[PDB]
RNA sequence: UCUCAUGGAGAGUUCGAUCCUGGCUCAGGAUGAACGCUGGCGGCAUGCUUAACACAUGCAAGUCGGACGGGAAGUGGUGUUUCCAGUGGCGGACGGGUGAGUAACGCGUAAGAACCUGCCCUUGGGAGGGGAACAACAGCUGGAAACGGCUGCUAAUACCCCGUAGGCUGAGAAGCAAAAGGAGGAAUCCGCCCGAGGAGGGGCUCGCGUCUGAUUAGCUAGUUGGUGAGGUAAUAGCUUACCAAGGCGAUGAUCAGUAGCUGGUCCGAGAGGAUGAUCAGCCACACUGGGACUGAGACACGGCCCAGACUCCUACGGGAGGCAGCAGUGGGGAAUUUUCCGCAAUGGGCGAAAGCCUGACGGAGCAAUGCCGCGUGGAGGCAGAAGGCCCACGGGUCGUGAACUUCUUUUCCCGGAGAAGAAGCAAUGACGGUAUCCGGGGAAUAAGCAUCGGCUAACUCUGUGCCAGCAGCCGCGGUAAGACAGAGGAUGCAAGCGUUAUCCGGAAUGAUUGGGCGUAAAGCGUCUGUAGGUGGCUUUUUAAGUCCGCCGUCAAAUCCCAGGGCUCAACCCUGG
């Protein structure tokens, strides 16, 4: 709700991973709800992220240009694994 | 700096002034944050909302010489010390 | 006579406050250079040795007096001083680091 | 039989005629308006949209002698005192003007951490002892001028050192750091130094929203990322060395073009469309570019340095300057104002205070530019007449209109009285003898513009003969023109009326609301399939979307409802 979820693509870089976030919005002028995407740069110093994973963001202040986030791990989450 | 004054708003040769406090930097109709009253010369009505003026006097708020006038027939200082 | 002008003042006032800042900077300038100078000296040279700290010391102290002397007037900001006094501090370590003192 | 709903109009034109489809045109409202004809007043507002083209002249930021040394004037060339070129302190980064640039944290909204902050407020502790200079000034000296040069003297809230420290650096040991006095019947206020907070202001980062073009598809190399060394008030490739090869993009990168943004303004049944004048907020610029000093704060409209173009002065060696500040000039253009009064009020800067400055601001003047309001007479006027036009030649219309008779005086003229705004004992008013009130005179001072073929309210006659000419569309005129011109009459508006230009509506004519593709414009020649879109049924999970209840915020002004005040209205104000 408050922070963005997002996808961890592109983690080659050190000390860094590319994460691509996603959004759903309604149109202005039509009011149908679009898949948007939008791309950032975050940290993990211990480096415990790699591709495949699901991260959450913070806010935080900026390590370098365009890199202005922290890396932490899901709050709620719906793993459920074989419940009755 | 906050400063408690008074800006003009009406018609020609017809003042209509209100108290407030503003920074002292920004222009007679600067954009306002808490309006503390309102007076005029001709009707002579005043109704100086105190609780919100205190507030500003305490942070260190300075008037001007007519609004340090207007307080002073209230019974404002008084009770500010 | 001549009139007044309150601009042309101000022109005035700045040049001689800059020869008295300028001058102000580059006495922190020089000193600091003193100390390098030495460092990279003691450094390569593989005699270790505690009473070679001493002059050093000397050094430290006419670079704090000129940086916080500078402080007392308009140059430097309180909190570039700490970054000037730090550099010193942070690269005199080195060379107890790098070495055995530790 | 409740309540909600105050809101959606069409017309002409393709055809011999009809039903459709589809464009064109009109009736509405608005304007920073311009032009044409006409023109009485008052109230509130508005007034270079083009050449961010170039500018003569005057003003627009000064202030403190209760910080200091000197100098001048006056006096009884004696005391008090008045004035200031210079040193020093604060303000000259506010206020004012302009949208050139800018497609992005610039703006709007909603959040954050790694920072600064003079003046104001609050608060904890201090100010001890010494010294050296530059100005002014005095002498000499170079210049046409602006501005200097040399030799010596001097004060300070100006400069320097020592001493002290609840602060700074560091793992620690240790090392370093300040200050100014002034006025005074002496209580004792204004200030100075260090440190911790409050508020306001400012800097930085981030989510979301933020023009057009694919006949621009690849772009980037300090470019994305780290480490170390730097650097900034502070985070940051902000800088640098090395290492890694990432970073952006077909949901539109890059490139090109356009543009200040917003609150809001106009239109619209609404959805939404267009737009960013005045007012208010942010940003940006200051002859064109670049750079830094000073300071708490600038890369500074009326500050400095350099280059370039232009203008002015010159004794030709050399100098001065930047109205996109007020007013005003030239030029451009269809087109937008006095080279005015005043700091009385409001607000701002300096000062202990008295007071000084304030082309901000408050007022006046010009313009029908717009909105609103009131006049250009009311009542009566039997019968008849002159006159214009028309006629079936009997009459009809202009026409109760006029004449005439009484009544009244907004307005007009004359003569008096006369403010509020002023806050502060009194005095202190640019506006201003202004608004306003009383008295006298007397219908006396005051209506024009377009249209009259259909859309579209309003008709005949004369003249002209596809001529002169009208026209928004359809189209009228070729000898009886309701369509041209004139006349009379009528209609619609009214100190305005019409023309032109620009935007919206009508236009469901880009059809989310709200259109269509058999033949009227519109289904790829066909199929397989990537991304993308959507997706059967049943029971649980979560609560992103969605719904409900609370909190904060989207400034004020404007719009909406109510209330009040200007004689009403426009308009101004209060509250929601
Ligand atoms: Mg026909
Ligand atoms: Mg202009
Ligand atoms: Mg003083
Ligand atoms: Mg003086
Ligand atoms: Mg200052
Ligand atoms: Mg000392
Ligand atoms: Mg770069
Ligand atoms: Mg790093
Ligand atoms: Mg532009
Ligand atoms: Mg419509
Ligand atoms: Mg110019
Ligand atoms: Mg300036
Ligand atoms: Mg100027
Ligand atoms: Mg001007
Ligand atoms: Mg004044
Ligand atoms: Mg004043
Ligand atoms: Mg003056
Ligand atoms: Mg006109
Ligand atoms: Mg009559
Ligand atoms: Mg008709
Ligand atoms: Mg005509
Ligand atoms: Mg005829
Ligand atoms: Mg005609
Ligand atoms: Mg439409
Ligand atoms: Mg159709
Ligand atoms: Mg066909
Ligand atoms: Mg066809
Ligand atoms: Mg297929
Ligand atoms: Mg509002």
């Known amino acids: 709700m408050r922070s963005m979820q997002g996808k961890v693509i592109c983690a080659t870089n050190d000390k860094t991973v590319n994460v691509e976030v996603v959004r759903l919005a309604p149109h202005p002028k039509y009011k149908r709800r679009v898949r948007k995407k939008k791309k950032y740069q975050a940290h ?38 074989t419940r009755p | 700096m906050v400063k408690l004054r008074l800006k003009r708003c009406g018609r020609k040769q017809r003042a209509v002034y209100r108290i407030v406090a503003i920074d002292v930097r920004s222009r007679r109709e600067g954009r306002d944050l808490q309006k503390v009253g309102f007076y005029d010369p001709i009707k002579s009505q005043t109704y100086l909302n105190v609780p919100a003026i205190l507030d500003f006097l305490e942070k260190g708020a300075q008037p001007t010489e007519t609004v340090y006038d207007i307080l002073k027939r209230a019974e404002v200082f008084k009770e500010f010390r | 006579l001549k009139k007044a002008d309150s601009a042309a003042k101000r022109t005035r006032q700045a040049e001689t406050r800059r020869l008295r800042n300028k001058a102000r900077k580059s006495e922190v ?71 055995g003192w530790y």
Not at chain 1, 51 to 71: M, N
Not at chain 3, 31 to 50: N, P, Q, W
């Open chain 1, 44 to 81: 993990d110093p211990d480096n415990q992220f790699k591709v495949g994973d699901w991260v959450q963001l913070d806010k935080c202040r900026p390590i370098s240009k365009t890199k202005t986030f922290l890396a932490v791990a899901p709050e709620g989450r719906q793993s459920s694994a």
């Open chain 3, 29 to 99: 300038k020089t000193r600091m250079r003193k100390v390098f100078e030495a460092l990279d000296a003691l450094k390569k040279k593989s005699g270790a040795s505690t009473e070679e700290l001493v002059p050093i010391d000397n050094l430290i102290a006419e670079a704090y007096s000129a940086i916080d002397k500078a402080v007392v007037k308009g140059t430097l900001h309180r909190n570039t001083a700490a970054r000037r006094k730090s550099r010193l501090a942070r690269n005199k370590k080195v060379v107890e680091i790098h070495h």
